């Protein structure tokens, strides 16, 4: 997509490696925020959004939590707590066209700047001067979407780059997207290290009498820490009895 | 026409089991003792606003009301949610190719999903961009009004549809009565019993007793005096002052003279 | 390209529409708007409408709202205009041009004009030429020089293409602008000049064709006294 | 349209008729050979990075944004349209530029209507006024010695391609019945090049 009208694939109920991403020399950058790219393989997510678009190489620095500038202002604001990867690759050999690819566009005029993920496809003539817009332009008032017009002869910062932002989400609702990491057997009544669908921890995985309602999935103590879990393969309810410790 | 909502529209805010606990949360809820709008089948399914989202309920064992349509346009002239229910079993579409806009039967569509002394209850919200549904089936004594009593609604689905919702309309078949009320951002204290089940609640905002219950995280409040908030008077106006004349900046010298 | 390939005579009747058509260079849908204008023939020009081929969205001046309907093919830059309230008094010339593209353009002005569309409207039907070779004589004379001509009347649509000895007798030739008569049909005049010593003896022919029916006339002009 | 006459090699200067509002930029001047497809001559205007680089300018007054043809070549003489930008795109009727000449009287000729027309149903008696300058020629018809015009259909040429004058077919168009009620069909021609009225005659039965 043009960056004013960015793509959003939403990812659920599937599994992937992320090294197949971060290993590849194709990626011009692999900027990460709130997560480390190698560590993604240890995790499961409620969902991911592959928010994705083309921008010119100059603009990639704007794609951060806590940043402002033309893309962040008018096209695609990241929240100032965005969690995930911004992956970019030079696409001058893909998106640029001789005579310019004008089918890649960006906004630079609006009544006010974007809020986080505030997608906006509006086309109305913008009031860049004292005159009313009249539904027509010439001067003082103008159409709000600039075009990049990408020519393959562009200088390296003016070249197009394909961007995928992996906007991860972890909610109270349990994970549905998984890393590549292989499962193991269950081990009750022993002190063990564990990863239940992205919940990392350590304790004694006792079985329980707790009546989880059919939608209820984690149980929590007063501390807002996981007291119980329902096993994501066998659906039995386990008390995570604390790890065995005391003073000496 | 109206009736009193009583204690209604409590639903499980999340999939987290908790037990024997008084846990406070801030979310879109039907506020206690608000007026619901009340309906009975004649001509009784106009289009209604959705606002933040809806509590909807009807006094049926009999499924005369069949479901809903939601969106901005509803008529699928943009992507519009359609839902149909076989009493408990649910069928869903999001279409922008043309719906049968007649909201009745006589006795670009990017997603789909499938799975009178009785009260059917629902809550609908669009928060986080996945549309969410919660429900109850329950027997009732009085058919005239929503019950003067406590219950809480489990989820049914949490669907990644991404539709702009501002309005909704219900669907019927004929040769029943129902109610509507609105969610608002509120803070509720919620009581979870030993069976992990929500069994009482308090709206912090309702009255000074309910503010105090939530200040103490407790349904019992003992005799005394309790500080629930600061009190502040808001500014009435924004007042601005400058001298009665304005020079304009010497940029053409102090920022940029005829030589740098 | 430059001259946008506007459709021609679009011969029509009132209470209707016609899909006027035009062509612009292949990629230009992504890089320019198309604008539309009206002109009465030999008279004033005025703006009529616009399309933005990124979305295919169109706009119209208030005089042309409902009377005009513009569309385009984003895959080719082919352009179209249904003249969606057509009348006999709407028998004007119509034009379109490549234009606009905002503060990304050098200055918004139009550049590639179309070749024009005289949408030819009447309440009357198509009719052949009636042709009248106007005599050289002592009256057709001023000293050593004389003139003669032909007049053509009650035909539709224009043209009738009057020419002198099939274009060989060019001496002082003029063919005049046509008049639309109260019948709803066209008429015009054409003239030629000659040495007045030859009023009865030079070869004078009006060669005329109503090309809209291919009806051709090759008539000797009658020489006459007075 | 309104017209100005100038010689080849003169410098033109003509007002935008759309300049009722000033506009924060002018757009362009478009030439036309009458009725046909217009042509961009001044462009990008209120700048001076403007127009076909051989000639022309637009900045000639800060509202009128004049058609400023720097040195008129024989193909510059045409009608012109004027256009401006400030939430705006409208056209004014500019002014025409025509090749200037010495005064030339009309060469006056009458043609009988054709006997073919007098048989079939009409008397379009033609007075050709040929190759006059300026364009302001006058005609009347001595219809039974009363004076008439407009029943004279009066079509006028483009500017002449050999001599830059103009011509008129004044064309007294009676029905065959009216031509049999009336009898006399002489023209009267008056023009700036003539010291007195010029007449040629036609009559029923000549």
- Do C149 and D126 count as a contact with CB atoms less than 8 A apart? yes
Chain D: residue nearest A134 by CA?
Answer: D87
For B99, counting Cβ atoms within 10 Å of its Cβ (0-12 exposed, 13-18 middle, 19+ buried), the class is middle
CB proximity A126 to D under 8 Å: no
For residues B157-184, one letter each, b for 16 or more C-beta atoms within 10 angstroms of the residue's C-beta and e for the rest, the string is ebbebbbebebbbbbbeeebbbbbbbbe
Chain breaks in chain B (C to N over 2.5 A) after: 43, 107, 115, 175
Maximum separation of any 2 CA atoms in chain C, in Å:
71
Tokens representing residue D158 in the block: 């483009």
Give the separation between CA D54 and CA D43, rounded to whole angstroms: 13
Q: Do B145 and B179 touch, CB atoms closer than 8 A?
A: no
Residues in B touching A214 (Cβ below 8 Å): 154
Tokens representing residue D84 in the block: 């401006």
Pairing of strands A191-196, D3-6: unpaired
Cβ atoms within 10 A of the Cβ of A12, count? Answer: 13
Give the separation between CA B160 and CA B15, rounded to whole angstroms: 17
Q: Which of D24, D27, D89 sits opposite A140 (nearest CB)?
A: D24
Alpha-carbon dihedral C94, C95, C100, C101, rounded to 10 degrees: 100
Q: Do B33 and B2 touch, CB atoms closer than 8 A?
A: no
Give the separation between CA D12 and CA D71, rounded to whole angstroms: 7
- Do C226 and D130 count as a contact with CB atoms less than 8 A apart? no
Vertex B30 angle, CA B26 and B31, to 5°: 80
Alpha-carbon dihedral C107, C109, C113, C119, rounded to 10 degrees: 150
C-alpha distances in angstroms, A185 versus A191, A205, A244? 14, 12, 21
Chain Cα centroid distance, residue A232? 24
C-alpha distances in angstroms, A136 versus C79, C87, D76? 20, 27, 31
Chains C and B touch (3+ CB pairs under 8 A): no
Kindly report the backbone phi and psi dihedral angles of residue D120, in degrees, each rounded to the nearest multiple of 5, phi listed first: -80, -25
CB proximity C176 to A under 8 Å: no
- Do C108 and A123 count as a contact with CB atoms less than 8 A apart? no
A195 DSSP β-pair partners = A200
A205 DSSP β-pair partners = A240
**DSSP readout, C14-50?**
SSB--EEEEE--GGGGGT-EEEEEEE-TTS-EEEEEE
CB proximity A211 to B under 8 Å: yes
CB pairs under 8 A between A and B: 51
Q: Which residues make Cβ contacts (< 8 Å) with residue B204, sequence separation at least 6?
A: B24, B186, B187, B188, B189, B210, B211, B213, B214
Q: Do B57 and B143 touch, CB atoms closer than 8 A?
A: no
Pairing of strands B177-182, B35-40: antiparallel
- What is the distance in angstroms between the CA of the first residue and the CA of the last residue of chain A? 62
Chain C: residue nearest D129 by CA?
Answer: C147
CB pairs under 8 A between A and C: 36
> Radius of gyration of chain D from Cα atoms?
22
Q: Do B48 and B169 touch, CB atoms closer than 8 A?
A: yes
Q: Which of C27, C52, C108 sits opposite A138 (nearest CB)?
A: C108
**Domain with B125 in it: what CATH number?**
2.60.120.960
Residue B78 maps to a domain: yes
- Do B14 and A172 count as a contact with CB atoms less than 8 A apart? yes
For B74, counting Cβ atoms within 10 Å of its Cβ (0-12 exposed, 13-18 middle, 19+ buried), the class is buried
Give the separation between CA D169 and CA D157, rounded to whole angstroms: 9
* B neighbour chains, 3+ CB pairs within 8 Å: A
CB proximity A111 to B under 8 Å: no
DSSP classification of residue B255: I
Place of tokens 């399914």: B45
DSSP classification of residue A112: S
Which of A6, D130, D165 has its CA nearest to residue C173?
D130
For residues D58-69, one letter each, b for 16 or more C-beta atoms within 10 angstroms of the residue's C-beta and e for the rest, the string is bebeeebbbbbb
Q: How many CA atoms lie within 13 A of C36 on its CB side?
A: 30
At B17, is the secondary structure helix, strand, or coil? Answer: strand
Give the separation between CA A50 and CA A66, rounded to whole angstroms: 20
At D74, is the secondary structure helix, strand, or coil? Answer: coil
**DSSP readout, D125-178?**
EEEEEEEEBSS--EEEEEETTEEE-SSEEEEEPPSPTTTS-EEEEEEEEEEHHH
Cβ atoms within 10 A of the Cβ of A158, count? Answer: 15
d(CA A99, nearest CA chain D) in Å: 22
Q: Do A47 and A169 touch, CB atoms closer than 8 A?
A: yes
- What is the distance in angstroms between the CA of the first residue and the CA of the last residue of chain D? 40
Give the separation between CA D139 and CA D137, rounded to whole angstroms: 7
Give the separation between CA B39 and CA B47, rounded to whole angstroms: 13
Which of A91, A89, A83 has its CA nearest to residue A117?
A83
Q: Do C147 and C135 touch, CB atoms closer than 8 A?
A: no
Q: Which of A125, A136, A139 sits opposite D24 (nearest CB)?
A: A139
Q: Do C38 and C58 touch, CB atoms closer than 8 A?
A: no
Chain breaks in chain C (C to N over 2.5 A) after: none
Chain A: residue nearest C25 by CA?
Answer: A99
Best residue in B16, B127, B136, B161 for a mutation probing chain A (most A CBs within 10 Å): B16
Kindly report the backbone phi and psi dihedral angles of residue A234, in degrees, each rounded to the nearest multiple of 5, phi listed first: -120, -10
DSSP classification of residue B14: S
CB proximity C183 to D under 8 Å: no
Residue B246 maps to a domain: no
Pairing of strands B167-174, A160-169: unpaired
Tokens representing residue A152 in the block: 């393959």
If phi > 0 it is left, if psi is from -120 to 50 it is alpha, else beta; for residue D116 that is alpha
Alpha-carbon dihedral C147, C152, C153, C158, rounded to 10 degrees: -130
Q: Which of A105, A123, A139 sits opposite C57 (nearest CB)?
A: A123
Residue B10 maps to a domain: yes
Q: Do B5 and B33 touch, CB atoms closer than 8 A?
A: yes
Q: Do C50 and A136 touch, CB atoms closer than 8 A?
A: yes
Which of C129, C127, C126 has its CA nearest to residue C217?
C129
Chain Cα centroid distance, residue D125? 23
d(CA B171, nearest CA chain A) in Å: 28
Tokens representing residue D139 in the block: 């005609």
- Do A129 and D23 count as a contact with CB atoms less than 8 A apart? no
**DSSP readout, D76-111?**
T-SEEEEEEESS---EE---EEEE----BPPEEEEE
Which of D104, D102, D98 has its CA nearest to residue D130?
D104
Q: Please give the resolution of this entry in Å, rounded to 1 decimal.
A: 3.7
Q: Do C188 and D155 touch, CB atoms closer than 8 A?
A: yes
Chains D and B touch (3+ CB pairs under 8 A): no
d(CA A149, nearest CA chain C) in Å: 8
Q: Do C49 and C70 touch, CB atoms closer than 8 A?
A: yes
Give the separation between CA A107 and CA A6, rounded to whole angstroms: 12
Tokens representing residue B116 in the block: 């009178």
CB proximity D84 to A under 8 Å: yes
Give the separation between CA C79 and CA C23, rounded to whole angstroms: 6
For B258, counting Cβ atoms within 10 Å of its Cβ (0-12 exposed, 13-18 middle, 19+ buried), the class is exposed
For residues B238-255, one letter each, b for 16 or more C-beta atoms within 10 angstroms of the residue's C-beta and e for the rest, the string is eeeeeeeeeeeeeeeeee
Residue B226 maps to a domain: yes
At A21, is the secondary structure helix, strand, or coil? Answer: helix
C-alpha distances in angstroms, D93 versus A27, C37, C46, D14? 58, 13, 9, 11
For D132, counting Cβ atoms within 10 Å of its Cβ (0-12 exposed, 13-18 middle, 19+ buried), the class is buried
> Radius of gyration of chain B from Cα atoms?
25
**DSSP readout, A150-167?**
B-TT--TTTSEEEEEEEE
Best residue in A173, A229, A231, A238 for a mutation probing chain B (most B CBs within 10 Å): A173
Place of tokens 């509120």: B186
Give the separation between CA C121 and CA C11, rounded to whole angstroms: 6
Q: Specify the length of chain A in residues.
A: 248
Which of C76, C75, C66 has its CA nearest to residue C25?
C76
Vertex A44 angle, CA A43 and A50, to 5°: 105
Identify the helix (H) or strand (E) that includes residue C208.
strand C205-210
Residue B242 maps to a domain: no
DSSP classification of residue D123: E
Q: Which of C107, C179, C193 sits opposite D153 (nearest CB)?
A: C179
Give the separation between CA C37 and CA C152, rounded to whole angstroms: 31
Give the separation between CA A183 and CA A194, rounded to whole angstroms: 11
CB pairs under 8 A between A and D: 38
Residues 25-84 of D with CB under 8 A from C: 25, 27-28, 30, 34-40, 43-45, 47, 81, 83
If phi > 0 it is left, if psi is from -120 to 50 it is alpha, else beta; for residue D93 that is alpha
Residues in A touching C56 (Cβ below 8 Å): none
Q: Do C221 and D113 touch, CB atoms closer than 8 A?
A: no
**DSSP readout, B214-239?**
HHTT-S---SS--------PPPS---
Kindly report the backbone phi and psi dihedral angles of residue B24, in degrees, each rounded to the nearest multiple of 5, phi listed first: -90, 135
Identify the helix (H) or strand (E) that includes residue C103.
none
Residue B153's domain spans which residues?
A: 2-232
- Do A143 and C59 count as a contact with CB atoms less than 8 A apart? no
Residue B207 maps to a domain: yes
Give the separation between CA C104 and CA B66, rounded to whole angstroms: 54
Which of B156, B92, B96, B91 has its CA nearest to residue B124?
B156
At C54, is the secondary structure helix, strand, or coil? Answer: coil
Give the separation between CA A174 and CA C116, rounded to whole angstroms: 66
Give the separation between CA D129 and CA D150, rounded to whole angstroms: 15
**DSSP readout, C121-164?**
B-SSPPB--EEEEEPPSGGGEETTEEEEEEEEEEEBSS----EE
Q: How many domains does chain B have?
A: 1
If phi > 0 it is left, if psi is from -120 to 50 it is alpha, else beta; for residue A189 that is left
Q: Which residues make Cβ contacts (< 8 Å) with residue D146, sequence separation at least 6?
A: none
Give the separation between CA D34 and CA D158, rounded to whole angstroms: 8
Residues 113-132 of C with CB under 8 A from D: 113-116, 130-132
Chain Cα centroid distance, residue B69? 16
DSSP classification of residue D133: B
Identify the helix (H) or strand (E) that includes residue B109.
none
Residue B257 maps to a domain: no
- Do C102 and A102 count as a contact with CB atoms less than 8 A apart? no
Identify the helix (H) or strand (E) that includes residue D153.
strand D152-156
Cβ atoms within 10 A of the Cβ of B100, count? Answer: 10
Tokens representing residue B90 in the block: 């649910």
Handedness of CA A36, A42, A48, A52 (dihedral sign): positive
Q: Do D184 and D145 touch, CB atoms closer than 8 A?
A: yes
If phi > 0 it is left, if psi is from -120 to 50 it is alpha, else beta; for residue C187 that is beta
- Do D89 and C47 count as a contact with CB atoms less than 8 A apart? yes
Which of C94, C79, C38 has its CA nearest to residue C61?
C38
For C195, counting Cβ atoms within 10 Å of its Cβ (0-12 exposed, 13-18 middle, 19+ buried), the class is exposed
Q: How many CA atoms lie within 13 A of A142 on its CB side?
A: 18
At C196, is the secondary structure helix, strand, or coil? Answer: helix
Residue B247 maps to a domain: no
Q: Do D27 and D85 touch, CB atoms closer than 8 A?
A: yes
Q: Do C109 and D40 touch, CB atoms closer than 8 A?
A: yes
Tokens representing residue D181 in the block: 């009620």
For A3, counting Cβ atoms within 10 Å of its Cβ (0-12 exposed, 13-18 middle, 19+ buried), the class is buried
């Amino acid at each position: 997509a043009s960056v004013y009208a960015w793509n959003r694939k939403r990812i659920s109920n599937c599994v992937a490696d992320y090294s197949v991403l971060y290993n590849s020399a194709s990626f011009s950058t692999f900027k990460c925020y709130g997560v480390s790219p190698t560590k993604l393989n240890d995790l499961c997510f409620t969902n991911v959004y592959a928010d994705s678009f083309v921008i010119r190489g100059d603009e990639v620095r704007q794609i951060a939590p806590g940043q402002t500038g033309k893309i962040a202002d008018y096209n695609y604001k990241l929240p100032d707590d965005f969690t995930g990867c911004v992956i970019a690759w030079n696409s001058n050999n893909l998106d640029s066209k001789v005579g310019g690819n004008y089918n890649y566009l960006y906004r630079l005029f609006r009544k006010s700047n974007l809020k986080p993920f505030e997608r906006d496809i509006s086309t109305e003539i913008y009031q860049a001067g004292s005159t009313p817009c009249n539904g027509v332009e010439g001067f003082n008032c103008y159409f709000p979407l600039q075009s990049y017009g990408f020519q393959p002869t562009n200088g390296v910062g003016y070249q197009p780059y394909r961007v995928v932002v992996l906007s991860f989400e972890l909610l109270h609702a349990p994970a549905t997207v998984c890393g590549p990491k292989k499962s193991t057997n269950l081990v009750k009544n022993k002190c063990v290290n564990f990863n239940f669908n992205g919940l990392t921890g350590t304790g004694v995985l006792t079985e329980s009498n707790k009546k989880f309602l059919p939608f209820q999935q984690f149980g929590r103590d007063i501390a807002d820490t996981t007291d119980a879990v329902r096993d994501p393969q066998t659906l039995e309810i386990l008390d995570i009895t604390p790890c065995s410790f005391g003073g000496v | 026409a109206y009736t009193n909502s009583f204690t209604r529209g409590v639903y499980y805010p999340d999939k987290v089991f908790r037990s024997s606990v008084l846990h406070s949360t801030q979310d879109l809820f039907l506020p206690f003792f608000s007026n619901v709008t009340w309906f009975h089948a004649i001509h009784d399914n106009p289009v209604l606003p959705f606002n933040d989202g809806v509590y909807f309920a009807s006094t049926e064992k009999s499924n005369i009301i069949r479901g809903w349509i939601f969106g901005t346009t509803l008529d699928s002239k943009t992507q519009s949610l359609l839902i149909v229910n076989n009493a408990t079993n649910v069928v869903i579409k999001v279409c922008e190719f043309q719906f049968c806009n007649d909201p009745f039967l006589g006795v670009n569509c990017t997603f789909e999903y499938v799975s009178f002394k009785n009260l059917r209850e629902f809550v609908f919200k669009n928060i986080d961009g996945y549309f969410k549904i919660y429900s109850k089936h329950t027997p009732i004594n009085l058919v005239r009004d929503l019950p003067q009593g406590f219950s809480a609604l489990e989820p049914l689905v949490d669907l990644p549809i991404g539709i702009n919702i501002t309005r909704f309309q219900t669907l019927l078949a004929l040769h029943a009565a129902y109610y509507v009320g609105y969610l608002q951002p509120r803070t509720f204290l919620l009581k979870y019993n030993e069976n992990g089940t929500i069994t009482d609640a308090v709206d912090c905002a309702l009255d000074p007793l309910s503010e105090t219950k939530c200040t103490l995280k407790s349904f019992t409040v003992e005799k005394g005096i309790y500080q629930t908030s600061n009190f502040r008077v808001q500014p009435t106006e924004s007042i601005v002052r400058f001298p009665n004349i304005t020079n304009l900046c010497p940029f053409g010298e102090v920022f940029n003279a005829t030589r740098f | 390209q430059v001259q946008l390939v506007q459709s021609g005579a679009e011969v029509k009747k009132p209470g209707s529409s016609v899909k006027v058509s035009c062509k612009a260079s292949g990629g230009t849908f992504s890089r320019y708007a198309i604008n539309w204008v009206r002109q009465a023939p030999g008279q004033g020009l005025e703006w009529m409408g616009r399309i933005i081929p990124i979305f295919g969205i169109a706009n119209y001046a208030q005089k042309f709202q409902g009377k005009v309907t513009i569309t385009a093919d984003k895959s080719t830059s082919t352009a179209y205009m249904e003249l969606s309230s057509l009348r006999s008094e709407d028998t004007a010339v119509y034009y379109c041009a490549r234009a606009d593209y905002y503060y990304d353009s050098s200055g918004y002005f139009f550049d590639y004009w179309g070749q024009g569309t005289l949408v030819t409207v009447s309440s009357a039907s198509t009719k052949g030429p009636s042709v009248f070779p106007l005599a050289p004589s002592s009256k057709s004379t001023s000293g050593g020089t004389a003139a003669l001509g032909c007049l053509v009347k009650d035909y539709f649509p224009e043209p009738v293409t009057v020419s002198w000895n099939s274009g060989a007798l060019t001496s002082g030739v003029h063919t005049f602008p046509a008049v639309l008569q109260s019948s709803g049909l066209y008429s015009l005049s054409s003239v030629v000049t000659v040495p007045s010593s030859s009023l009865g003896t030079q070869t004078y022919i009006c060669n005329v064709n109503h090309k809209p029916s291919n009806t051709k006339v090759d008539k000797k002009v009658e020489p006459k006294s007075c | 349209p309104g017209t100005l006459s100038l010689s080849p090699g003169e410098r033109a200067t003509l007002s935008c008729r759309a300049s009722q509002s000033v506009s924060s930029s002018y757009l362009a001047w478009y030439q036309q050979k009458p009725g046909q497809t217009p042509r961009l001559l001044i462009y990008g205007a209120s700048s001076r990075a403007t127009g076909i680089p051989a000639r022309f300018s637009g900045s000639g007054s800060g509202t009128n944004f004049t058609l400023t043809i720097s040195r008129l070549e024989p193909e510059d003489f045409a009608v012109y349209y004027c256009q401006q930008y400030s939430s705006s795109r409208t056209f004014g009727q500019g002014t025409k530029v025509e090749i200037k000449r010495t005064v030339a009287a009309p060469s006056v000729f009458i043609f009988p209507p054709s006997d073919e027309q007098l048989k079939s149903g009409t008397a379009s008696v033609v007075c050709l006024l040929n190759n006059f300058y300026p364009r302001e020629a006058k005609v009347q018809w001595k219809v039974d010695n009363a004076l008439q015009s407009g029943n004279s259909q009066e079509s006028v040429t483009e500017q002449d391609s050999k001599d830059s004058t103009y011509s008129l077919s004044s064309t007294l168009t009676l029905s065959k019945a009216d031509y049999e009620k009336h009898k006399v069909y002489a023209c009267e021609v008056t023009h700036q090049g003539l010291s007195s009225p010029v007449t040629k005659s036609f009559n029923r039965g000549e």
